Amino acid sequence: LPARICRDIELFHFDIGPFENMWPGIFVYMIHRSCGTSCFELEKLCRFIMSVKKNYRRVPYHNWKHAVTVAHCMYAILQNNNGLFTDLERKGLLIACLCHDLDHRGFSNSYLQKFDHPLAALYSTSTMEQHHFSQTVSILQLEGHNIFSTLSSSEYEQVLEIIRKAIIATDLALYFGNRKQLEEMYQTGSLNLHNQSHRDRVIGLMMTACDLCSVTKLWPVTKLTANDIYAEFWAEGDEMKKLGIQPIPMMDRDKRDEVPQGQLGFYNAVAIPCYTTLTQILPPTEPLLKACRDNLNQWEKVIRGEE
Ligand SMILES: COc1cc2ncnc(N3CCc4cccc(S(=O)(=O)N5CCN(C)CC5)c4C3)c2cc1OC
Numbered sequence: 001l002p003a004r005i006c007r008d009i010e011l012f013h014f015d016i017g018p019f020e021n022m023w024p025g026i027f028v029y030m031i032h033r034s035c036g037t038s039c040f041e042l043e044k045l046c047r048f049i050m051s052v053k054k055n056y057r058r059v060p061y062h063n064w065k066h067a068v069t070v071a072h073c074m075y076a077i078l079q080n081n082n083g084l085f086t087d088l089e090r091k092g093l094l095i096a097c098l099c100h101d102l103d104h105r106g107f108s109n110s111y112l113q114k115f116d117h118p119l120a121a122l123y124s125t126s127t128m129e130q131h132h133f134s135q136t137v138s139i140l141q142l143e144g145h146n147i148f149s150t151l152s153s154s155e156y157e158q159v160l161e162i163i164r165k166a167i168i169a170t171d172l173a174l175y176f177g178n179r180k181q182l183e184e185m186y187q188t189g190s191l192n193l194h195n196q197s198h199r200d201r202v203i204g205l206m207m208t209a210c211d212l213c214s215v216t217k218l219w220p221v222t223k224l225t226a227n228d229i230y231a232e233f234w235a236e237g238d239e240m241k242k243l244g245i246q247p248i249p250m251m252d253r254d255k256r257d258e259v260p261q262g263q264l265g266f267y268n269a270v271a272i273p274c275y276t277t278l279t280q281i282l283p284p285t286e287p288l289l290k291a292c293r294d295n296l297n298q299w300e301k302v303i304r305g306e307e
């Protein structure tokens with residue numbers, strides 16, 4: 001409802017605030033405005049949302065707040081590209097974002113593998129992401145929760161496949177390959193949005209851009225969210241030491257003073273290329289890239305004192 005939110009939710013750098021009880025209706029507004037008002041049945045969507053929340057954990061960063069925030073980014077990169085994505089893609093992607101870290105425990109796929117976690121045995125590749133999709137499907141199959149019930153069986157299978165690929169694409173390991181393939185398409189002029197295999201890549205890149213979106217907010221938000229990101233990284237580093245393994249410095253709390261250098265690394269190697277390639281394919285997403293560059297600059301001031 002709020003008027004300040006009705007306005008500021010269109011900004012890419014929107015922050016969803018500290019009131020957890022407002023997040024559901026922020027998400028329903030977004031879906032209403034993106035997809036339609038009669039496209040989802042309110043009462044069923046409302047409980048689907050509540051059940052997703054319940055299945056997210058009280059971790060510092062990969063939590064319910066993150067889930068709604070990634071959804072908001074995707075809303076801003078749907079609103080600003082009217083006519084490029086189908087009604088089905090718009091429904092699936094908003095839901096994929098809300099669901100994409102379901103039951104995340106604050107640990108990377110490497111750590112589950114080195115820990116010999118049961119989930120690893122089950123899903124060899126992209127371990128957590130396969131689990132998230134599996135949990136999404138389980139939420140949908142719960143009675144009263146099939147937000148997709150108004151849909152043909154074929155359209156159902158289609159949206160679940162859109163959701164599946166988008167969730168899987170949040171495995172940052174896949175991004176590097178995806179982005180390389182897209183960058184060659186851009187430059188040879190071979191990218192074809194009429195081609196479904198190419199559309200899959202573009203959505204994958206969109207899922208990355210949205211998942212990383214802490215680095216596109218204004219500096220006070222970005223800096224604060226970074227505290228939560230490192231809180232998980234350090235906890236994982238502690239768990240790695242407990243296994244008998246020196247963690248990379250990124251995850252070693254004893255190397256906390258190198259966070260600024262760490263951020264230079266991440267922005268140059270990951271974030272700037274991600275949002276550059278995104279901007280090349282979808283020019284209206286330029287504000288994401290601009291904010292990312294501003295944030296890189298801030299990390300650059302921090303290294304030399306200025307902050
Ligand atoms: C907003 O801040 C974030 C957000 C991040 N989001 C998610 N993954 C992050 N990880 C793990 C997956 C991954 C894959 C490929 C490259 C990187 S890297 O470029 O940062 N760098 C590679 C070289 N290594 C020695 C140290 C890390 C990362 C870093 C990350 C890291 C991060 O700041 C450090």
Ligand SMILES: [Mg+2]
Binds near residue numbers: 100101104170171
């Ligand atoms: Mg994830």
Ligand SMILES: [Zn+2]
Binds near residue numbers: 101
């Ligand atoms: Zn995420």
